[PDB]
């Protein structure tokens, strides 16, 4: 019933052979600005911070520059208009924040290596899976400067929850990584160790089960991976000799759940030790003359944290949890230890540093005018690139060719403006406002006698509820998801929306949405 | 240069004074380097776009999902992206508008990185299309039918080698070595042995070898290699460089196509029955008719200027310019007669970088193909997305504004002028460099491929290289022999490079110690 306003008219933007005069150009750009401004101010349904006024003032001066961070961030190449000194400072910030070992040093296998992304986490998760595929499959590594048989040994299997973002399923297809489901169905069709809770049959699920909700099924659950189910699936493939890739979601896309990274790691480490995956000889080729195995020693598992969203705020929440009286806040929910600092003892290999890589999107929690982000891992995981006759070192070891050198400035400017304490306050207000929205939605159910189906995973900055009219969804940019309440049965479909409480979402904005929700024709219904 | 100490981000943040001093240092560095950059194919003047578009910096714009679908993230510029894709579709003789019901209509999207993304996408799309993965619109005993083979010249950008490895696409060299090790149909010009070359040979220069050649693919050699694999049942992927990275060469796309079409017709690759699955009930093999070849044009650079040069070539008195060099027909308009006197549209995809010829403040560009090549994505319930063929995450919605603002400022005639001026200035630089060799009595090895906007020559001092951002390439004059190494640089004459800049560079080259000390 409310108005989202007009969309842009294609006729205003058509680019003729003769060009557009200045008046037609400005009218068009004004139309874009009017549209974008109205939508930016009402966006509450996506995990994207919208207020960046300071960054625009600070950094508009750089727009005349064709900046290019071509090549490795730690190497000084020929394209001199680059921001790699800035990129390194941002990577250093996050390396400390995620308890990685800094500075980066090609001589120290445990030091971090990472780079800033020219897309968002889509690029970072692709790189992770490329890096993990090759590492676990035995491709040659960048060896630092100084100072069996098992037919499944080169066949990594990938594991992740049903809450994993779809762009992650694309990356599996792009890179030819095999999921446990595909390998299950191809090689082990009748050997599925899980019983399906709907049918009671041992059918291979398409992803690792997420934890169930009041229904007994994942659709109304928290969206966190079922650690028990994961451990059963990993054991199965690990016992057969496959190396193992596990993606864990730190701030899942629809429910904002945090997979319990520490619990997963504690549960899986003994499985990896029992099956020889902590340290295992890997054939990475063969030099001619009766030397059929060239062999180095690697770990046979790779744990990746998809922190597209949550890697930007979780360290700050956990900083508060460690010193609640210092920050004047005790977070309601515990967020798992997830970073490069997570180390666990073993029966006979010493302490193991569990996480191999993390991705984060800069345009999610921090906010940016375009997609950007960070991929980070350790020097010891770096793959050797394809050989050529130009003889300086490894500088193409990134996904992108040309690389965005403006994004470093954006995130540098952001991080320079907020202290740790300021970052704690941002995640505090978002957490408290998400709790408030959930309280207000349940009060509205009681006031009006309408069902809203509100749900919020403890510790998430998102709240899901019944989808209102298309016009309201369009006005406030509410992301939608349909769920089937009983898998395979289309008559049990429910339509949800969610609101993400980012730092640019305040009380007033939420109260204005709630006021329209209360008069919405679908919500009031019939 | 720039001190890292100035940019360290402390736990407590930086105050407004430290922040501004650091940004000023960056801006002073960048401004000095931008105004002297002449060694990379990146246009450096975009003062108008900055004035027009800095107002958008406060918006988190996201073009998530397909450019031709609505989505839930309403702060997007998809209407603008479409205008831009429409402009390039016209320019490249693609069929407009995009229409999912018309197999011949274009589909494309604007890239969030540069052509690295576009070439990756092309090879992904080709791999799946040629290997029998399911399409969006469908309405043995060849054991090689699902094993595509990739071909490209030795001048191909290193981005392709990376994409090949990322996607598991197998090159002719890898397949040759694995399956057909003793069957190489080419003789190596240095050794005389039938050793599989690592890439398709480029054309020779005065040396008899490719290092001093123009950097264009050897069409004969490509034809012999393609026939070899095509005869064995493999589908075929061919990348053609339209403005190669170091020499700015243009592979003769029309000649390649003319040459390869007979090969594809002889070996059943124009219309090939492809097994994409089998039905659940009885397991009968499901079949769709596809082409068994894919020609991609890597136009990272040259898809931005080549249509304007060819416009002049077609009406030289109308534009007041006859280009010296002929650039090949390369785009979606390229159609050849079949044996049965029908027509076949030869090119399947084109990539272009917006930050190369046009200029932009960050990497961007275009991937374009046709509706009939679109692959069906993985089967799972998305969040407010219909069929979706992108990488499925966030997409840069600011780059559409950058390129829209650029394209709107210039007529076809103005774009013709930009390529004219760059061609004439590249010719000028080559004349000046040869004059300098005679004036100073030194060897500068200058070279310029006819029709290229780049000129290569002997690498000067590190100081000069660093000031003018000159890109460097080493060559071995006899492949394998380390004592034959030569170090070249190049200059790219982009629209932001004028005569004054080239004259200032030349005056410094004439007094450079490495140039004067040149044995």
PDB file of C-alpha atoms in Angstrom, chain B residues 86-179:
ATOM      1  CA  UNK B  86      23.731  -2.205 -25.076  1.00  0.00           C
ATOM      2  CA  UNK B  87      26.299   0.328 -26.362  1.00  0.00           C
ATOM      3  CA  UNK B  88      29.050  -2.284 -26.586  1.00  0.00           C
ATOM      4  CA  UNK B  89      26.626  -4.854 -28.053  1.00  0.00           C
ATOM      5  CA  UNK B  90      25.960  -2.382 -30.938  1.00  0.00           C
ATOM      6  CA  UNK B  91      29.631  -1.569 -31.272  1.00  0.00           C
ATOM      7  CA  UNK B  92      30.577  -5.272 -31.507  1.00  0.00           C
ATOM      8  CA  UNK B  93      27.682  -6.110 -33.913  1.00  0.00           C
ATOM      9  CA  UNK B  94      25.859  -8.294 -31.361  1.00  0.00           C
ATOM     10  CA  UNK B  95      22.051  -8.694 -31.577  1.00  0.00           C
ATOM     11  CA  UNK B  96      20.085  -6.284 -29.300  1.00  0.00           C
ATOM     12  CA  UNK B  97      18.144  -6.242 -27.113  1.00  0.00           C
ATOM     13  CA  UNK B  98      19.047  -9.086 -24.832  1.00  0.00           C
ATOM     14  CA  UNK B  99      16.101 -11.472 -24.861  1.00  0.00           C
ATOM     15  CA  UNK B 100      16.215 -14.872 -23.114  1.00  0.00           C
ATOM     16  CA  UNK B 101      13.786 -16.257 -25.749  1.00  0.00           C
ATOM     17  CA  UNK B 102      16.182 -15.357 -28.674  1.00  0.00           C
ATOM     18  CA  UNK B 103      19.236 -17.689 -28.764  1.00  0.00           C
ATOM     19  CA  UNK B 104      21.143 -15.262 -31.022  1.00  0.00           C
ATOM     20  CA  UNK B 105      20.688 -12.234 -28.733  1.00  0.00           C
ATOM     21  CA  UNK B 106      23.557 -11.072 -26.605  1.00  0.00           C
ATOM     22  CA  UNK B 107      23.952 -11.719 -22.924  1.00  0.00           C
ATOM     23  CA  UNK B 108      26.811 -10.092 -20.941  1.00  0.00           C
ATOM     24  CA  UNK B 109      27.535  -8.389 -17.675  1.00  0.00           C
ATOM     25  CA  UNK B 110      29.888  -5.804 -16.306  1.00  0.00           C
ATOM     26  CA  UNK B 111      32.852  -7.190 -14.482  1.00  0.00           C
ATOM     27  CA  UNK B 112      33.815  -6.383 -10.855  1.00  0.00           C
ATOM     28  CA  UNK B 113      37.502  -7.000 -11.578  1.00  0.00           C
ATOM     29  CA  UNK B 114      39.081  -6.510 -15.013  1.00  0.00           C
ATOM     30  CA  UNK B 115      39.306  -8.872 -17.973  1.00  0.00           C
ATOM     31  CA  UNK B 116      40.860 -11.463 -15.695  1.00  0.00           C
ATOM     32  CA  UNK B 117      37.260 -12.092 -14.576  1.00  0.00           C
ATOM     33  CA  UNK B 118      35.982 -11.969 -18.149  1.00  0.00           C
ATOM     34  CA  UNK B 119      38.532 -14.422 -19.494  1.00  0.00           C
ATOM     35  CA  UNK B 120      37.875 -16.672 -16.489  1.00  0.00           C
ATOM     36  CA  UNK B 121      34.170 -16.534 -17.228  1.00  0.00           C
ATOM     37  CA  UNK B 122      34.731 -17.196 -20.926  1.00  0.00           C
ATOM     38  CA  UNK B 123      36.783 -20.305 -20.226  1.00  0.00           C
ATOM     39  CA  UNK B 124      34.274 -21.502 -17.566  1.00  0.00           C
ATOM     40  CA  UNK B 125      31.366 -21.019 -19.973  1.00  0.00           C
ATOM     41  CA  UNK B 126      33.316 -22.718 -22.834  1.00  0.00           C
ATOM     42  CA  UNK B 127      34.488 -25.618 -20.643  1.00  0.00           C
ATOM     43  CA  UNK B 128      30.903 -26.377 -19.589  1.00  0.00           C
ATOM     44  CA  UNK B 129      29.365 -25.716 -23.012  1.00  0.00           C
ATOM     45  CA  UNK B 130      31.909 -27.865 -24.847  1.00  0.00           C
ATOM     46  CA  UNK B 131      31.958 -30.642 -22.189  1.00  0.00           C
ATOM     47  CA  UNK B 132      28.138 -31.224 -22.259  1.00  0.00           C
ATOM     48  CA  UNK B 133      26.947 -29.557 -19.017  1.00  0.00           C
ATOM     49  CA  UNK B 134      23.219 -28.585 -19.128  1.00  0.00           C
ATOM     50  CA  UNK B 135      22.181 -25.253 -20.815  1.00  0.00           C
ATOM     51  CA  UNK B 136      19.516 -22.733 -19.716  1.00  0.00           C
ATOM     52  CA  UNK B 137      17.606 -23.134 -23.028  1.00  0.00           C
ATOM     53  CA  UNK B 138      17.764 -26.601 -24.616  1.00  0.00           C
ATOM     54  CA  UNK B 139      14.375 -25.667 -26.181  1.00  0.00           C
ATOM     55  CA  UNK B 140      29.547 -43.216 -28.356  1.00  0.00           C
ATOM     56  CA  UNK B 141      32.136 -43.970 -29.750  1.00  0.00           C
ATOM     57  CA  UNK B 142      34.252 -40.814 -29.457  1.00  0.00           C
ATOM     58  CA  UNK B 143      35.974 -41.036 -26.065  1.00  0.00           C
ATOM     59  CA  UNK B 144      37.308 -37.433 -26.594  1.00  0.00           C
ATOM     60  CA  UNK B 145      33.855 -35.830 -27.051  1.00  0.00           C
ATOM     61  CA  UNK B 146      33.792 -34.333 -23.482  1.00  0.00           C
ATOM     62  CA  UNK B 147      37.470 -33.300 -23.349  1.00  0.00           C
ATOM     63  CA  UNK B 148      37.878 -29.762 -24.727  1.00  0.00           C
ATOM     64  CA  UNK B 149      41.348 -28.599 -25.836  1.00  0.00           C
ATOM     65  CA  UNK B 150      42.471 -24.930 -25.528  1.00  0.00           C
ATOM     66  CA  UNK B 151      44.637 -23.043 -27.992  1.00  0.00           C
ATOM     67  CA  UNK B 152      46.222 -19.578 -27.800  1.00  0.00           C
ATOM     68  CA  UNK B 153      49.413 -17.863 -28.917  1.00  0.00           C
ATOM     69  CA  UNK B 154      52.615 -17.319 -27.011  1.00  0.00           C
ATOM     70  CA  UNK B 155      51.649 -13.595 -26.781  1.00  0.00           C
ATOM     71  CA  UNK B 156      48.593 -14.467 -24.598  1.00  0.00           C
ATOM     72  CA  UNK B 157      48.420 -12.707 -21.231  1.00  0.00           C
ATOM     73  CA  UNK B 158      49.521 -14.750 -18.171  1.00  0.00           C
ATOM     74  CA  UNK B 159      45.923 -14.293 -16.854  1.00  0.00           C
ATOM     75  CA  UNK B 160      44.930 -17.077 -19.253  1.00  0.00           C
ATOM     76  CA  UNK B 161      47.457 -19.573 -17.948  1.00  0.00           C
ATOM     77  CA  UNK B 162      46.031 -18.892 -14.520  1.00  0.00           C
ATOM     78  CA  UNK B 163      42.411 -19.276 -15.632  1.00  0.00           C
ATOM     79  CA  UNK B 164      43.271 -22.574 -17.417  1.00  0.00           C
ATOM     80  CA  UNK B 165      44.680 -23.964 -14.131  1.00  0.00           C
ATOM     81  CA  UNK B 166      41.802 -22.575 -11.987  1.00  0.00           C
ATOM     82  CA  UNK B 167      39.178 -24.149 -14.225  1.00  0.00           C
ATOM     83  CA  UNK B 168      41.025 -27.420 -15.126  1.00  0.00           C
ATOM     84  CA  UNK B 169      40.868 -26.651 -18.849  1.00  0.00           C
ATOM     85  CA  UNK B 170      43.541 -28.609 -20.664  1.00  0.00           C
ATOM     86  CA  UNK B 171      45.771 -26.900 -23.212  1.00  0.00           C
ATOM     87  CA  UNK B 172      46.871 -28.520 -26.449  1.00  0.00           C
ATOM     88  CA  UNK B 173      50.352 -28.824 -24.948  1.00  0.00           C
ATOM     89  CA  UNK B 174      49.237 -30.722 -21.840  1.00  0.00           C
ATOM     90  CA  UNK B 175      46.939 -33.058 -23.890  1.00  0.00           C
ATOM     91  CA  UNK B 176      49.691 -33.470 -26.505  1.00  0.00           C
ATOM     92  CA  UNK B 177      52.225 -34.487 -23.843  1.00  0.00           C
ATOM     93  CA  UNK B 178      49.758 -36.770 -21.977  1.00  0.00           C
ATOM     94  CA  UNK B 179      48.005 -38.543 -24.822  1.00  0.00           C
TER      95      UNK B 179
END
